[PDB]
Amino acid sequence: SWEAGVILIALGVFVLYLGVKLLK
Amino acid sequence: SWEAGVILIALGVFVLYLGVKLL
């Protein structure tokens, strides 16, 4: 269960990045 | 809009927590 945490973490970071990007 | 980015930020925080818990 290593890859699953990394995948989900990357996904969350990405969605957070989009959220911050919309603040433009 | 702004609310959409704020919502996405909340989504990312939640998904990130699930990811960290999964380690």
Residues 6+ apart with CB under 8 A from A3: none
**Can you tell me the distance from the alpha carbon of B20 to that of A24, in angstroms, rounded to the nearest whole number?**
28
Q: B-chain residues within 8 Å CB-CB of A12?
A: 11-19
Sign of the CA dihedral running A16, A19, A23, A24: positive
**What are residue A23's phi and psi, to 5 degrees?**
-80, 55
The chain B residues in contact with chain A (CB within 8 A) are 1-2, 4-23
